[PDB]
Coordinates of C-alpha atoms and ligand atoms in Angstrom, one line a residue:
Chain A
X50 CA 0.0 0.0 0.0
X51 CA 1.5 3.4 -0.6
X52 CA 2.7 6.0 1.2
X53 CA 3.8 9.4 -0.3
X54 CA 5.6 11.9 2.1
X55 CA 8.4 14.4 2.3
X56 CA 11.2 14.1 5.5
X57 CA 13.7 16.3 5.9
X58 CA 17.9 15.5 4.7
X59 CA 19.4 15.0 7.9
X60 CA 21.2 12.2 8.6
X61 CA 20.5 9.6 11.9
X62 CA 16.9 11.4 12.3
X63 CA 14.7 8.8 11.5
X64 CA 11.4 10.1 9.8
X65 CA 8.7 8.0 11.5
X66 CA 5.2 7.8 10.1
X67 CA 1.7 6.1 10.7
X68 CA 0.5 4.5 7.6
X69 CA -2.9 4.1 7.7
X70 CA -5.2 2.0 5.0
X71 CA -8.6 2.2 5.2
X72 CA -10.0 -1.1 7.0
X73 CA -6.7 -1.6 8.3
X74 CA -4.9 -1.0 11.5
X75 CA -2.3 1.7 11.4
X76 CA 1.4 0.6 10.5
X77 CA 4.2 2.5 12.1
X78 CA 6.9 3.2 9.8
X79 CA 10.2 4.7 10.6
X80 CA 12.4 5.4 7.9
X81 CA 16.1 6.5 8.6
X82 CA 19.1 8.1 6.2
X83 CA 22.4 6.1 7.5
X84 CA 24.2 8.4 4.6
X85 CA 23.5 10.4 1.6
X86 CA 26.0 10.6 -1.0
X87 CA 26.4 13.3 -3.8
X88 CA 28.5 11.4 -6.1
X89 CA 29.7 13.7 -9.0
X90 CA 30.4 12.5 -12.5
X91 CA 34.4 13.4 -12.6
X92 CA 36.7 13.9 -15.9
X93 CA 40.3 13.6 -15.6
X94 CA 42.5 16.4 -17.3
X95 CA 45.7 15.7 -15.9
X96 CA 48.2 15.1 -13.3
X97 CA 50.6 17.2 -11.6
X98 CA 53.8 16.3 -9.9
X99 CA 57.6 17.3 -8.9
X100 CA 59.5 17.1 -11.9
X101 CA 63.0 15.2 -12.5
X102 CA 66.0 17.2 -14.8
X103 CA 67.1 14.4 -16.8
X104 CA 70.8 15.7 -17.6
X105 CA 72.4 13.3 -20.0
X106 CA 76.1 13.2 -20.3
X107 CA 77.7 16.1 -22.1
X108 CA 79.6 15.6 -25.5
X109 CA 82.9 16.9 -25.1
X110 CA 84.2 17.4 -28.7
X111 CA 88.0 17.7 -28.7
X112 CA 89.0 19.6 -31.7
X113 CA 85.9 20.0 -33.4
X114 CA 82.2 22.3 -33.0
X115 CA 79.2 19.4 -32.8
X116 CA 76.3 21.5 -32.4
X117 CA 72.7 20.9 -31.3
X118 CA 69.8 19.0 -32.6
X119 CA 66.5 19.6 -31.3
X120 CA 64.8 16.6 -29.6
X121 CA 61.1 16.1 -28.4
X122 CA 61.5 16.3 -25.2
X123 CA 59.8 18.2 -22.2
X124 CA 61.7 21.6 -22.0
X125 CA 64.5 20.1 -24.1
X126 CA 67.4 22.4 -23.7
X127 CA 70.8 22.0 -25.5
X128 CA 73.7 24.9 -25.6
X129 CA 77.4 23.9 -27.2
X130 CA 79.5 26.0 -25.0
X131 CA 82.5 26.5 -26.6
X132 CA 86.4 27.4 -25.8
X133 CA 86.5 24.0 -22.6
X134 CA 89.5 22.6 -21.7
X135 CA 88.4 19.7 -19.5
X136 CA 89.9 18.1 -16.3
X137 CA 89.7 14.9 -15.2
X138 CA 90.7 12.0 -13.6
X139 CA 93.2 11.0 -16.0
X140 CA 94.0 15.1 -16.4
X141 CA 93.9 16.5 -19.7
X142 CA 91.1 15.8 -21.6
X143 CA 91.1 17.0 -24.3
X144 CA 93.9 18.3 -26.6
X145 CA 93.6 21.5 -28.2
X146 CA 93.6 24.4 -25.5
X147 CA 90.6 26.5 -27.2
X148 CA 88.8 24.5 -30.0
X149 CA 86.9 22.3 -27.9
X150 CA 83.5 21.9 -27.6
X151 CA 80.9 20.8 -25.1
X152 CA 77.6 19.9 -26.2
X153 CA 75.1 20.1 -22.6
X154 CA 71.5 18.7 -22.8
X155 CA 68.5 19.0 -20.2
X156 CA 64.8 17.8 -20.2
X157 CA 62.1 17.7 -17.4
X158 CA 60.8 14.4 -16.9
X159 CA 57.8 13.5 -13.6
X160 CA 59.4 12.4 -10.6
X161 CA 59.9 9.1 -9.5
X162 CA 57.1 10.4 -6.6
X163 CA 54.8 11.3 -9.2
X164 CA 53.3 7.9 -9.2
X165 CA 52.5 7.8 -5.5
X166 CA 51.9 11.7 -4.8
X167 CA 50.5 13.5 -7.3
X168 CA 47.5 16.1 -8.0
X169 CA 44.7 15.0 -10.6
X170 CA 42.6 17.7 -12.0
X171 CA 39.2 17.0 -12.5
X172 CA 36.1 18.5 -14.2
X173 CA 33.6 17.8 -11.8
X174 CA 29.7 18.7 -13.6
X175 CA 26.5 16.4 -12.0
X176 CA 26.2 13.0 -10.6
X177 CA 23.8 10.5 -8.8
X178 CA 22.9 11.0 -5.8
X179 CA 22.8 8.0 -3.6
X180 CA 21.8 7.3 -0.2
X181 CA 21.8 4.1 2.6
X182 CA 18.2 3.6 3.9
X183 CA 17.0 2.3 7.3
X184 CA 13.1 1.1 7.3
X185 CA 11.0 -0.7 10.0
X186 CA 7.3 -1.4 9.9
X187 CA 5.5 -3.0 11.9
X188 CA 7.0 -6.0 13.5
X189 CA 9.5 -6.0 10.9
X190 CA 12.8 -5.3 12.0
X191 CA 15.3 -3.0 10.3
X192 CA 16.5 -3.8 6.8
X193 CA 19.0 -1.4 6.2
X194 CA 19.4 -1.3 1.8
X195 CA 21.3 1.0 -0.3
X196 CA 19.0 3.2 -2.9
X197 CA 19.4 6.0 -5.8
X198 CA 17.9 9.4 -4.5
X199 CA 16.0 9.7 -8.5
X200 CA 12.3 9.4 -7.5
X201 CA 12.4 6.8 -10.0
X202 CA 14.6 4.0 -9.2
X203 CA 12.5 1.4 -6.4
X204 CA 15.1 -0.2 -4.3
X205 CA 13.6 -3.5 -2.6
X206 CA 14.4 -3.1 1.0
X207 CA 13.0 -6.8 2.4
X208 CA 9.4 -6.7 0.8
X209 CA 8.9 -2.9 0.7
X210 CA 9.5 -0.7 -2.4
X211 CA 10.9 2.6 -2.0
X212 CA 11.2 5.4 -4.1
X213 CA 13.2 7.8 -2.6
X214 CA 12.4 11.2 -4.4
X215 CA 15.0 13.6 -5.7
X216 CA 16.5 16.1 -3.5
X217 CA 15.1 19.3 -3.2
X218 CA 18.4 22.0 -3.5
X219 CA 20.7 20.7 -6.6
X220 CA 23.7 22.2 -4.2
X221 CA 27.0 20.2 -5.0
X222 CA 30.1 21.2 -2.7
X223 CA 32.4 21.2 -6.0
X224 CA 32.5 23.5 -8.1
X225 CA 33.7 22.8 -11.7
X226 CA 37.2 22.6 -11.2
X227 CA 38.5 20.8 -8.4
X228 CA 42.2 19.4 -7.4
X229 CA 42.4 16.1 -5.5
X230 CA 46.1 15.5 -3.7
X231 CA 46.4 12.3 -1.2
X232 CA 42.5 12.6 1.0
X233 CA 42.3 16.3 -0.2
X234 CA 39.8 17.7 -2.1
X235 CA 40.3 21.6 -3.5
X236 CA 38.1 23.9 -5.0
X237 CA 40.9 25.2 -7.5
X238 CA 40.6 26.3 -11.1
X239 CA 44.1 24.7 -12.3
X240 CA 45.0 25.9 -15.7
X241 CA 44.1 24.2 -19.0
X242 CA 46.5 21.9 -20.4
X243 CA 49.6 23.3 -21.8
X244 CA 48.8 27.0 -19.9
X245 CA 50.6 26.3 -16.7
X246 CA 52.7 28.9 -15.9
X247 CA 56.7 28.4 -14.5
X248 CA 56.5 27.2 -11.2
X249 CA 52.7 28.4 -9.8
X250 CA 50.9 24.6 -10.4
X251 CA 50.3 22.8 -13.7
X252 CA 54.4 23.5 -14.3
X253 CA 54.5 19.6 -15.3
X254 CA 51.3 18.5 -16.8
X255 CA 50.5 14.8 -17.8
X256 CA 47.1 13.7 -18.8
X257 CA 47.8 9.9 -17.2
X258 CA 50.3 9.2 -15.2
X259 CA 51.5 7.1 -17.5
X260 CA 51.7 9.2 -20.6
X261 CA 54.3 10.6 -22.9
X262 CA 53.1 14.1 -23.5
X263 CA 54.2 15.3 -20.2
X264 CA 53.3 19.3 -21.3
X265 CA 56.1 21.2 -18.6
X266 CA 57.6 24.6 -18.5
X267 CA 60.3 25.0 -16.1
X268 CA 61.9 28.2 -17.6
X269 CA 65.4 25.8 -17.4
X270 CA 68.2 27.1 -18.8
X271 CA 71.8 25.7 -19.4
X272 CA 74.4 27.4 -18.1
X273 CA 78.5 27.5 -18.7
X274 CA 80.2 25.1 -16.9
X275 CA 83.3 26.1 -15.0
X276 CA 86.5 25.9 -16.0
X277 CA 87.8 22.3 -15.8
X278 CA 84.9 20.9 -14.9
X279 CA 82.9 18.7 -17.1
X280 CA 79.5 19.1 -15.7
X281 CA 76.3 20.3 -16.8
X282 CA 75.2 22.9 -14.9
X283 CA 71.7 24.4 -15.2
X284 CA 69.2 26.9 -13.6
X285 CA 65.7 25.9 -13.2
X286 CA 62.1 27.5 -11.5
X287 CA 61.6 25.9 -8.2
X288 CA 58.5 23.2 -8.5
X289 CA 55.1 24.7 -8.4
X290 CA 54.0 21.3 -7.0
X291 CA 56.1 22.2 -3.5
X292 CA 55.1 26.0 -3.8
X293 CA 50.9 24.6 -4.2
X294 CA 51.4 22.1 -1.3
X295 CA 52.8 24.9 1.0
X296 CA 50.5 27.5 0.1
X297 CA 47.5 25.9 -0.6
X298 CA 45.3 27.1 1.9
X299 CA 42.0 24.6 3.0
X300 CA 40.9 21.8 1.4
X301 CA 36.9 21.4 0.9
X302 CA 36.9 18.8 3.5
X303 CA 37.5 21.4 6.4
X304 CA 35.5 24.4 4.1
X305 CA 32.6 22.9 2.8
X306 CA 28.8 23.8 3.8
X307 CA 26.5 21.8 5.7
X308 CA 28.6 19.3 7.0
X309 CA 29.6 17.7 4.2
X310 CA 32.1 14.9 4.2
X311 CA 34.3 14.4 1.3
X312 CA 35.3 11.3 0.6
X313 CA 37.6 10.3 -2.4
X314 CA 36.8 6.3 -3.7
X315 CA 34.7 7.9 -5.6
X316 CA 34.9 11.4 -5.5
X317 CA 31.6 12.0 -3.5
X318 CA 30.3 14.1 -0.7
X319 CA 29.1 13.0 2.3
X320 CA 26.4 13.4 4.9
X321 CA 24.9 16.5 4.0
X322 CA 21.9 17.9 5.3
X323 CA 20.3 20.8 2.6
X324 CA 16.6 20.2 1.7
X325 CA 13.8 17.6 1.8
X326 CA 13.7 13.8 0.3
X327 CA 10.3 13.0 -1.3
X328 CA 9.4 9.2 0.0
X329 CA 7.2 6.6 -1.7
X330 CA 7.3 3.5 0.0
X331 CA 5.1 0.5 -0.7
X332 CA 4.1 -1.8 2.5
X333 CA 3.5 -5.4 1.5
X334 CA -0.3 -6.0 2.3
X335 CA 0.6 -9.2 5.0
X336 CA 2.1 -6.4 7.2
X337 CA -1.3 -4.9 8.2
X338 CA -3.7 -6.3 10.2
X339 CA -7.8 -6.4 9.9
X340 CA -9.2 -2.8 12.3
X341 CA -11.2 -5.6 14.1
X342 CA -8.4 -7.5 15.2
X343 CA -6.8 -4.4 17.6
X344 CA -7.7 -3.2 20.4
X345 CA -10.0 0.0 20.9
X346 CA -8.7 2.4 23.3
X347 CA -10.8 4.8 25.0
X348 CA -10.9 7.5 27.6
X349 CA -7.6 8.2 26.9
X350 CA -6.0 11.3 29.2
X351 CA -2.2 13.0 28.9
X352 CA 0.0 14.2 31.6
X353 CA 2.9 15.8 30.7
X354 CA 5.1 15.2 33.3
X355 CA 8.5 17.0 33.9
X356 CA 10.0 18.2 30.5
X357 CA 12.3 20.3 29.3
X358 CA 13.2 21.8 25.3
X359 CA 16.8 20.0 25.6
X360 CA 18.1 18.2 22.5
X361 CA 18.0 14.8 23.6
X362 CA 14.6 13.3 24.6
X363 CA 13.6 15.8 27.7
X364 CA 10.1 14.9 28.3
X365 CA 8.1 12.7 29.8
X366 CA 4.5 12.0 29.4
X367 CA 2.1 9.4 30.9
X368 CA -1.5 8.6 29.4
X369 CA -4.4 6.6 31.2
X370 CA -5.6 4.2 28.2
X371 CA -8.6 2.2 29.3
X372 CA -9.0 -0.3 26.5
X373 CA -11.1 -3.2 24.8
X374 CA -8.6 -5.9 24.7
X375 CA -4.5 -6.2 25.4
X376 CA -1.9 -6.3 23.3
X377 CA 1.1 -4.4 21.4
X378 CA -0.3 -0.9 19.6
X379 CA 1.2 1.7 17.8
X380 CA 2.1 5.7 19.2
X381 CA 2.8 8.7 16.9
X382 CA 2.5 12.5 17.1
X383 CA 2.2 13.8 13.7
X384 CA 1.8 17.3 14.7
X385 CA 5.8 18.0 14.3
X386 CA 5.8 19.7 17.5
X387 CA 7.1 16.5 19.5
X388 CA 9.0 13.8 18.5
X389 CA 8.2 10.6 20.4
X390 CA 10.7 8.3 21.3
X391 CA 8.9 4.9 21.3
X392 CA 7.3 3.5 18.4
X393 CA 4.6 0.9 20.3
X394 CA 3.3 0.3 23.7
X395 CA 2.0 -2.6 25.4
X396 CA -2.1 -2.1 26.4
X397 CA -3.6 -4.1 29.4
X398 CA -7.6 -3.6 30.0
X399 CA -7.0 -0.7 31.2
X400 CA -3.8 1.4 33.2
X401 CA -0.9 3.5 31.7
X402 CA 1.7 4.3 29.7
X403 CA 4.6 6.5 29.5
X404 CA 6.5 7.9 26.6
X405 CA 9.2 9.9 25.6
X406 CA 9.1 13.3 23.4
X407 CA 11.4 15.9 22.0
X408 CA 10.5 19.1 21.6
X409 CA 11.7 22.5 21.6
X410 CA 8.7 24.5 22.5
X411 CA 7.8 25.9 25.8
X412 CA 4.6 25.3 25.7
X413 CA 4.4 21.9 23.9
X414 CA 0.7 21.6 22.8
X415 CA 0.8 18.3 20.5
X416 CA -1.9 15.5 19.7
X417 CA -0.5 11.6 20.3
X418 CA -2.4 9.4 18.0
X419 CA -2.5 6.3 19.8
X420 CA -3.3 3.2 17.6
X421 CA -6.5 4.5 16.4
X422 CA -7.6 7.4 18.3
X423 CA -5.7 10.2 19.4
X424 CA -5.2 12.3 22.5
X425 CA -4.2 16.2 23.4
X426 CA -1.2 16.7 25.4
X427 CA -0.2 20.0 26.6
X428 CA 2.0 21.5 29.5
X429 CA 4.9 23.7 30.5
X430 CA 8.9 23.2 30.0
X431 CA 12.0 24.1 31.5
X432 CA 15.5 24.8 30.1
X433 CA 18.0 22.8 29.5
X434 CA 21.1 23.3 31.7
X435 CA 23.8 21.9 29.1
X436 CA 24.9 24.7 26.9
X437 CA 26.8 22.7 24.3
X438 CA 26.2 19.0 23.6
X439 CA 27.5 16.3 21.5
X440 CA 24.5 15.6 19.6
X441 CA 22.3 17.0 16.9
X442 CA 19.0 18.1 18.0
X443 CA 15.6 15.6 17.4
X444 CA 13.1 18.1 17.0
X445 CA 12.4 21.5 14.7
X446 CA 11.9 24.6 15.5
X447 CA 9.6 27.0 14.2
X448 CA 9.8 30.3 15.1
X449 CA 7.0 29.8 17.5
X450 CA 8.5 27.5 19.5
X451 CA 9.8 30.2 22.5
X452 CA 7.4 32.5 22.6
X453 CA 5.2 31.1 25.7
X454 CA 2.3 32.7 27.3
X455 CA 3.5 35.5 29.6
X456 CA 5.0 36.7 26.1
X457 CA 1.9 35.9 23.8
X458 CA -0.4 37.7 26.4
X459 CA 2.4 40.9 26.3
X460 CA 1.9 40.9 22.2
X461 CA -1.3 40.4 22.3
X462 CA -2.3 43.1 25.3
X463 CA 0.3 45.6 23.4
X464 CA -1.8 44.7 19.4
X465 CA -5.2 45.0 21.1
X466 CA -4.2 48.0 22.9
X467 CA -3.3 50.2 19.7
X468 CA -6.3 48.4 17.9
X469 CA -8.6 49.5 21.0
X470 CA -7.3 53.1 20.9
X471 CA -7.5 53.5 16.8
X472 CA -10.9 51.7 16.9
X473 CA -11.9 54.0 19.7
X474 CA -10.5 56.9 17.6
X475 CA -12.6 56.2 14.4
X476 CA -15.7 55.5 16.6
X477 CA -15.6 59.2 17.6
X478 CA -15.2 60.1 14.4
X479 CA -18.5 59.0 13.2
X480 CA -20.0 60.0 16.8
X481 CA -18.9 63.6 15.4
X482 CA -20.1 63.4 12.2
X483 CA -23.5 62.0 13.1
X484 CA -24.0 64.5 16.0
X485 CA -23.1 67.8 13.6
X486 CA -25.6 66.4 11.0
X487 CA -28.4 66.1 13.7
X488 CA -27.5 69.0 15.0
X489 CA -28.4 71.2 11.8
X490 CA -31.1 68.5 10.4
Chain B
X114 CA 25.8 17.2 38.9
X115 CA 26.2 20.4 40.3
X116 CA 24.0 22.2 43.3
X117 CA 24.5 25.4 44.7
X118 CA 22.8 26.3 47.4
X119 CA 23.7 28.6 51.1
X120 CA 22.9 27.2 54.2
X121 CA 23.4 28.7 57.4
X122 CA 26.5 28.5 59.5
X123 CA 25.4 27.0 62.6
X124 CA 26.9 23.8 63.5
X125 CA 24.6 20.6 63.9
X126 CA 21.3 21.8 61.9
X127 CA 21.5 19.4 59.2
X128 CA 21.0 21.5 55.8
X129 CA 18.5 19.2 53.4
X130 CA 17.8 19.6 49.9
X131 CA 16.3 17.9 47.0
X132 CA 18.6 18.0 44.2
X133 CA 16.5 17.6 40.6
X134 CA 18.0 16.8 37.8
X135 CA 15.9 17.1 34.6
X136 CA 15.0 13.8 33.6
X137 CA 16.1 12.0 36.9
X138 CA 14.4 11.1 40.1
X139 CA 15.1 13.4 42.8
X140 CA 18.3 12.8 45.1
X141 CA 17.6 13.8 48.9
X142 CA 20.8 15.8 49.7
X143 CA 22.0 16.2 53.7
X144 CA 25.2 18.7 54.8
X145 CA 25.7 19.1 57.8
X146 CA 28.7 20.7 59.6
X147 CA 30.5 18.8 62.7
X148 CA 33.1 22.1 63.9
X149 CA 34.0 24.9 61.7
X150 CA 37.6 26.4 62.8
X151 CA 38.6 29.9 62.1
X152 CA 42.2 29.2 62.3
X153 CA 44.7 32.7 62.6
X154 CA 48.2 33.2 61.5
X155 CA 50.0 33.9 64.5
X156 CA 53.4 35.2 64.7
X157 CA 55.2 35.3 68.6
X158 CA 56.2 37.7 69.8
X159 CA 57.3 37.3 73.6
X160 CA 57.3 35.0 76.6
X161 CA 56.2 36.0 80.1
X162 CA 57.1 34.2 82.7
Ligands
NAG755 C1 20.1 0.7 10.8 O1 20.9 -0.1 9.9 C2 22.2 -0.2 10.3 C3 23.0 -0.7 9.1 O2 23.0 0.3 8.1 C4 22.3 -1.1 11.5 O3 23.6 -1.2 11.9 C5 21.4 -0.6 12.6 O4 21.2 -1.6 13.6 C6 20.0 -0.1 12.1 N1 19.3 0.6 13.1 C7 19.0 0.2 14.3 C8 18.3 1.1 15.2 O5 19.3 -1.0 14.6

């Protein structure tokens, strides 16, 4: 049998419901998020990393000028410095004291690192939304089944179907660029391939990290080498990778709205509690049970006894339930004032039961629908002591909830007061008017 | 869980209280005071004798 309804994004606040089917005894159903997962569709551009300056050995030319020939290589650099007399080992490498030449050769290559630490940029545009869902009804115990937040995918969860409607707010904590590095996620618009600049991030660009493009710009230059010395000397911008990972300022995991949790198998943000869930589930017909086959309660009457608008479940209520026969029956409060802890209670002939609530108002003024008929409970509450706690609140407010009475009857005594006066104002009005025009006519 | 409260300073009057705690039966609470010792900081200066 269906059920439509809306509950709200939170996580670990269970949504609890009575389904009720004409004929049929009411079904309590109490369905809970255990996670909600914004999984975006990602597109690799490419991979960033330290970069190695492959230096090949120099060709020292004794009496001759070789000269260079370009290569395709990353940020190839050759230079034939000329007028090298050598030193070695041996002593006196070459012959001729000025002819000689020295051909010096440089190329950026990745890192041997850049396999195991590495940046990928990613184009980040829309992706499923998914979601693990805990439902009980009835004497059914939880099932606990993983759906697709669509409002069109059913997901069999035991022998219910539910259709999990689409979030409400499209908000993604990515934006369209993004930078992943280890567990970190950043919001950072990286430049396009074969843009980066010398040594800000993107200097070494590879789409793969096993490719052979390897786009880098390291602004390396060959220099001279000194006199005797056969080495290959050479001037380079320091890595952008190092500068980015000491000045990057926050990943989104710290940043990011709501609460989200980013986690990165795949890329996808967790636990995040912006708008409302449409529900559609589907009870399987041998869960409820024929209206003649429960008990009738009657003469049903609420105490509130001590409470207090704290976060956990502060209140305590007892009702006196004379019924028709014993047995387990359902409790709900569907005014969204309270939340009740318990979802059944046991009924004798006749006695009482207490339950739990949540609430945030002063004044909580909420109707408990107990198996089939329903009773008014109001009273007074009390502070909480605790400032801060540990745990997310159970209830809602709603801008009502703190007024209370001493403050309603202020408002109201202050609004009936200026009424009263301008009323009284525009009475005399008329009283003037109509006594002038009997007093000529 | 914390209770403030004054109670007066005579010595043997048991000071009772019922200390609530919302959402937990009431405790009965008893202090009492045995001797209470104002205790100076003397400093000698001389002996008679
Ligand atoms: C909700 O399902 C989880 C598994 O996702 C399970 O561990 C837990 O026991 C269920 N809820 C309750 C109240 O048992």
């Amino acid at each position: 049998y269906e059920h439509t309804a809306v509950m709200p994004n939170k996580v670990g606040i269970p949504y609890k419901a009575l389904v009720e089917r004409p004929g049929y005894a009411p079904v309590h159903l109490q369905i809970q998020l255990v996670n909600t997962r914004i999984i975006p569709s990602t597109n690799l551009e490419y991979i960033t990393c330290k970069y190695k300056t492959k230096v090949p050995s120099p060709v020292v030319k004794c009496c001759g000028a070789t000269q260079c020939t370009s290569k395709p290589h990353p940020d190839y650099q050759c230079q034939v410095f000329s007028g090298v007399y050598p030193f070695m080992w041996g002593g006196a490498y070459c012959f001729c004291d000025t002819e000689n030449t020295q051909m010096s050769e440089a190329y950026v290559e990745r890192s041997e690192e850049c396999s195991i630490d590495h940046a990928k940029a990613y184009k980040v545009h829309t992706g499923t939304v998914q979601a693990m869902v805990n439902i009980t009804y009835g004497s059914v115990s939880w099932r606990s089944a993983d759906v697709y937040v669509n409002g069109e995918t059913p997901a069999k969860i035991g022998d219910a179907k539910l259709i999990i409607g689409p979030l409400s707010s499209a908000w993604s904590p990515f934006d369209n660029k993004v930078v992943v590095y280890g567990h970190e996620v950043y919001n950072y618009d990286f430049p396009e391939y074969g843009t980066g600049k010398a040594g800000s991030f993107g200097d070494l660009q590879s789409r793969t990290s096993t490719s052979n493009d390897l786009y880098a710009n390291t602004n390396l230059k060959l220099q001279r080498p000194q006199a005797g010395i056969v080495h290959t000397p050479f001037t380079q911008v320091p890595s952008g990778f190092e500068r980015w990972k000491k000045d990057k300022g926050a990943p989104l995991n710290d940043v990011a709205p709501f609460g989200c949790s980013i986690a990165l198998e795949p890329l996808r943000a967790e636990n995040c509690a912006v708008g409302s869930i449409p529900i559609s589930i589907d009870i399987p017909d041998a869960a409820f049970t024929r209206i003649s086959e429960t008990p009738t309660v009657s003469d049903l009457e609420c105490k509130i006894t001590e409470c207090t608008y704290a976060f956990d479940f502060g209140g305590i209520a007892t009702v006196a339930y004379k019924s028709s026969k014993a047995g387990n029956c359902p409790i709900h409060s569907p005014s969204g004032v309270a939340v009740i802890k318990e979802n059944d209670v046991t009924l004798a002939e006749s006695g009482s039961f207490t339950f739990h609530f949540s609430t945030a108002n002063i004044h909580p003024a909420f109707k408990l629908q107990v198996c089939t008929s329903a009773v008014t409970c109001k009273g007074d509450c009390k502070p909480p002591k605790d400032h801060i706690v540990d745990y997310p609140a159970q209830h809602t407010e709603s801008f009502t909830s703190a007024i209370s009475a001493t403050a309603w009857s202020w408002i109201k005594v202050l609004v009936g007061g200026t009424s009263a006066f301008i009323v009284l104002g525009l009475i005399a009005t008329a009283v003037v008017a109509l006594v002038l025009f009997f007093h000529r006519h």
